[PDB]
Ligand binder design. Structure first.
Ligand SMILES: [Ca+2]
Ligand SMILES: [Ca+2]
Ligand SMILES: [Ca+2]
Ligand SMILES: [Ca+2]
Lengths: 26, 243, 239, 243, 26, 239
């Protein structure tokens, strides 16, 4: 399906956004 | 906005600040952000209106990266240069906007059939293009323009174009300009906060239309975000003045 | 408004209403609907000749039929309903002197007042609502629930406190006058004698205690505060 | 109207009344009953005009339950959402109205043929749609627009639309908005008191038209009836913001 | 024919409207 | 103070109390104990740093546990008793916002008000007494009868008239502050969270008529009229 729909669990929080703990996003 | 002047502590001598060239060639100054946002941006170039649908939906939102075309992605009915217009570039710097937007709609026709433009206030969804509301198979007996919502009509034989101003009919203080991912499935009430409603165009017979959008006079932007990561390959597509 | 200590005749603090040769007392408080206007200005045009009033006959209180409220009544139930002036001429209190002028005049403008007196005991409870619907011919069966009653001019009766209620009814009709009587020689194209409807409905069922009475009664009284007659004719029996 | 404040005898303390939000988003207040009734309601969506008839009759009456569509009943030429427009909802609360109504008529054409709109004062009947007055078989020699009644003309090649205001030409003080049963056969003079006349549209050749109605400026409603029994099944046709 | 034309005799008066004596209409 | 004649909603002459975001009405009269002083002058010395108040949280009415009174209660019987502030923090209305500041401050001075609302019917009868005993730790079981209650600040409730009662409680303690919480790291040499006791006692047994209810209920509500906190610390769960 659409890969944009959901963020992988290891980089996101329960709200489907990058976790503030996940520093590597940049 | 923070200029950063606070970090410039050097106080040694400098060369002159000179004299501004603004107004030397003409008095047509084009640096006002609101002035820029008030000139029209083409959204849909000659798209089809089909009477089998409720109408063609236009989400009320200004041009920005939310409508940017990326080589390789699926084909949408949006014109491909929206993301590089000066106004989209400006909007990509402000995540808040409040006020009205103006839509210039042109029906490619000279018929005496009325084409209606109906305004839908903020309802929570964000759609564009032809849609059969509630998936029915006939809409002439239950037209959206005849349900009570504010509606205006175009009669091509008189003027195939019209300019309508849609209000800021939403519960929020500001509309959210953009998201990092326009297709991410996140908290549904937040998902719909990037629009303030819709404009629905409904024809009598199949016909084509073009749509432009611009900021109204009662309009403000805010929540400056700073510049995003960008790219350019302009250099490769032109000769220099030295052959 | 304020009770007194008991004496030989109990708490003697009643209030009363005297209209013409009729008096009605009340033991507790009374609720009254707003005094509202009727259409004015058409009278002198719809009738080339002077219109008349007979206050001593029409402005006195006249009791109509008794209303029984039982523990079986459900909310929204119609306890009674009146098409006026018709029902006050040919169905309720038919020999009332208040009806005299209607025997000779063919048209009229009417403003009334209806007083409701209830008598439930201290171990009972319940709520009744009375409302008026102007120019109701062919529209009685819609906007006819307790909700519409609470929106139109109305009075509410509590079945254990026995507060009295007075409904003030102005003349609001789509024509200048209402016709007073049907007649073999009169047209059948226009239904006469009805410019409004009065509904008495259950708001909250009457309840009683162990071995208590399963019912209680309410009595309506009407009087015209302003009855103007036009178009004199020979006298006829009512409906 | 009786607010019921008369029955609220409690005088103990309460929480604050707060501050109104009216005018916070914009100054476009939409609570005035007359303002609401002055915006157009679609009655007929693309219906046919046939020159073999006297014309297409439009009874002069505001939108209300008298034109409400009920699933299962016979098909009429009336659009199906009239009964759910805000103005029909308002009219269902007032049984009296006095003043003029405005009709916006659109002829789907660009021809140079004149289409006439004739006003008929209150005559006692209440009809709509194509009709052959007195059941004749030819009307071009005895046109209703040429008999003496007030008439206006539309010339589509100039403007396919027109807005006409019809007067309150009746013998009554007020027009009766609605009946409990629009099809009941009762006293004939009373039966016709729900309209103040008719508007008749007559073409030269077969053509289609659309019709909208709204209250005029000289217009009042009264005889508040309170709300009727209603229904709604909206919930079933949309997702909630929690999937 | 059309059932709306006439109200049944037991619930109406001579004017083809609900009789004021017919309380069950609600 | 004076009743009125009956109307739609009965005798609408209630009084009410509004404190912060809470309101409490009363149908009849109310009895209130005297407004008396607390020790003043030690606050600025016992705490080198400023003390705090959070009125919007602490000065609102909070209902605590329901009290059942039955025909079997004898004079002098304890219907309920509270060690305060302790019982209002860890046993009654535990999620109340009034308890918030006690999670972070270790000391405090408290002045309260307690309202008691009773609901016995017109065929019942009885008397209840509520009193306060200042700094009661290790002295609850003496001077604890109805006689001592009638001598200390108190309010009396009649079970058939349903008068309300308001007990005003000043801060009278043998130390400058009372400790708010016990903690594994806190000393065990001083029992914390108790500067007073409130007793609800039977003065005269509840009685009822033939086939009448054998009980009725009373509900206490508290609010701080002046809660001053001192000694900020990390937040902890209450007791
Ligand atoms: Ca320098
Ligand atoms: Ca220089
Ligand atoms: Ca207040
Ligand atoms: Ca206030």
């Amino acid at each position: 399906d659409n890969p944009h729909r959901f963020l992988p669990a290891n980089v996101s929080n329960r709200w489907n956004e990058y976790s503030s703990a996940y520093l590597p996003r940049v | 906005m923070d200029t950063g002047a606070k970090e410039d502590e050097d106080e040694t001598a400098n060369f002159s600040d000179g004299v501004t060239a603004m107004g030397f060639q003409s008095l047509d100054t084009q640096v006002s952000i609101k002035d820029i946002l008030r000139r029209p941006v083409l959204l849909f170039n000659h798209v089809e209106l089909d009477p089998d649908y409720t109408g063609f939906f236009i989400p009320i939102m200004p041009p920005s990266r939310m409508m940017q075309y990326k080589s390789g992605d699926k084909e949408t009915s949006f014109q491909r240069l929206i993301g590089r217009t000066p106004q989209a570039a400006i909007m990509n710097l402000f995540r808040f906007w409040r006020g009205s937007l103006r839509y210039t709609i042109i029906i490619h026709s000279t018929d005496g059939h009325p084409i209606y433009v109906t305004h839908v206030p903020h309802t929570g969804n964000r759609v564009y293009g032809l849609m059969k509301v509630n998936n029915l198979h006939e809409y002439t007996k239950v037209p959206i323009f005849g349900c009570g919502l504010t509606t205006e009509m175009i009669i091509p034989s008189v003027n195939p174009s019209i300019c309508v101003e849609v209000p800021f009919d939403t519960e929020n203080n500001w509309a959210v300009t953009f998201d990092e991912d326009a297709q991410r499935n996140y908290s549904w009430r937040d998902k719909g906060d990037t629009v303030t409603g819709h404009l629905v165009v409904t024809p009598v017979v199949s016909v084509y239309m073009s749509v432009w959008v611009e900021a109204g006079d009662d309009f403000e932007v805010s929540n400056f975000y700073g510049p995003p990561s960008v790219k350019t390959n302009d250099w490769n597509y032109a000769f220099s003045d030295e052959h | 408004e304020v009770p007194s200590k008991e004496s030989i005749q109990g708490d003697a603090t009643q209030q009363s209403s005297k209209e013409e040769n009729t008096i009605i007392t009340r033991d507790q408080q009374q609720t009254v609907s707003e005094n509202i206007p009727s259409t004015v200005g058409d009278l002198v045009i719809a009738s080339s000749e002077p219109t008349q009033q007979f206050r001593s006959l029409t402005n006195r209180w006249m009791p109509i039929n008794s209303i029984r409220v039982t523990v079986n009544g459900k909310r929204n139930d119609l306890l009674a309903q009146y098409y006026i002036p018709e029902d006050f001429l040919s169905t309720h209190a038919k020999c009332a002197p208040n009806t005299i002028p209607f025997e000779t005049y063919v048209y009229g403008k009417y403003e009334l007042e209806m007083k409701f007196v209830a008598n439930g005991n201290k171990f009972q409870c319940g709520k009744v609502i009375i409302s008026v619907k102007f120019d109701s011919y062919q529209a009685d069966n819609i906007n006819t629930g307790f909700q519409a009653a609470l929106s139109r001019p109305h009075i509410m009766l509590d079945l254990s406190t026995n507060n009295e209620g007075v409904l003030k009814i102005p003349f609001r009709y789509h024509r200048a006058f209402v016709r007073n009587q049907t007649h073999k020689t009169a047209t059948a194209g226009v239904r006469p004698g009805k410019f409004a409807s009065i509904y008495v409905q259950v708001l909250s069922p009457l309840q009683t205690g162990e071995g208590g009475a399963n019912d209680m009664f309410i009595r309506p009284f009407y009087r015209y505060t302003r009855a103007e007659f036009a178009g004199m004719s020979y006298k006829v029996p009512l409906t």
